[PDB]
Design a protein around this ligand. Structure first.
Ligand SMILES: *[C@@H]1O[C@H](CO)[C@@H](O)[C@H](O)[C@H]1NC(C)=O
Lengths: 92, 76, 92
């Protein structure tokens, strides 16, 4: 289990907790082969200074990287820039 | 308010499939939910098991197909 | 173009118009290989007699027959027994 807690506290799959405070989209986990998946995540400043950062958007690029799923920080799950209704059960 | 809310404590529409979307392997979370019985209805409060729903559109507990709408399962 | 007009007037891909008046689910078109797709359609009686039939439900079994899309006769497009919001653009 990899965890991304607080604004900036990454705990890797092998222990190893560390603090980062970024401002970009970052690759959190991706499969190495050519395609499999890629999990992104926005770690941008939410408060006043640059040291007050927050997670804002989780992006999942699945199914041979042709389906993009976006998890905004107000609910609002949207598939390929279009709102979806939950639950949403598919084949993969 | 619960401390052990899980995916498969859902409505009787989840009982219509009952093997399609349960997804074991996650962790329980804490939110608003119903107690050990009286499963969730289509909207609003959670009525008991006898007059839950019959899920197609979720029909009320007075409809006869020949399947009388009953507690959770249907006599089909 | 294959057309299914009225309650019961099938026009095949090669001309050949005919009248049927069924009461079942029927296979309208399906791919021959092992999977590709299958398009169903309900032709049931809607009026009083059995000769007054209507189209009622179009069922599409696509993406290696793991995704079922249902077109009821009141709008109400639903994917895998769950309502969807339109438009709904995917990879396939
Ligand atoms: C959660 O724990 C309570 C114990 O107070 C009990 O209702 C039951 O074990 C759990 N409820 C569920 C699984 O709905």
């Amino acid at each position: 289990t990899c965890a991304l807690e607080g604004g900036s506290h990454i705990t890797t799959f092998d222990g190893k907790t560390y603090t980062f405070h970024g401002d970009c989209y970052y690759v959190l986990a991706k499969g190495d082969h050519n395609d499999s998946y890629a999990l992104l995540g926005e770690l941008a400043p939410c408060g006043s200074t640059d040291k007050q950062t927050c997670l804002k958007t989780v992006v999942l690029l699945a199914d041979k990287k042709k389906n993009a799923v976006v998890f905004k920080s107000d609910g609002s799950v949207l598939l390929n820039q279009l709102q979806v209704n939950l639950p949403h059960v598919t084949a993969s | 308010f619960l401390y052990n809310l899980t995916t498969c404590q859902q409505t009787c529409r989840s009982l219509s499939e009952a093997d399609s979307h349960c997804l074991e392997g996650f962790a329980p979370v804490d939110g608003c939910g119903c107690p050990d019985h009286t499963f969730l209805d289509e909207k609003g409060r959670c009525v008991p098991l006898a007059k839950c729903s019959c899920y197609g559109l979720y029909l009320e507990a007075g409809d006869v197909v020949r399947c009388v709408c009953r507690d959770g399962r249907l006599h089909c």
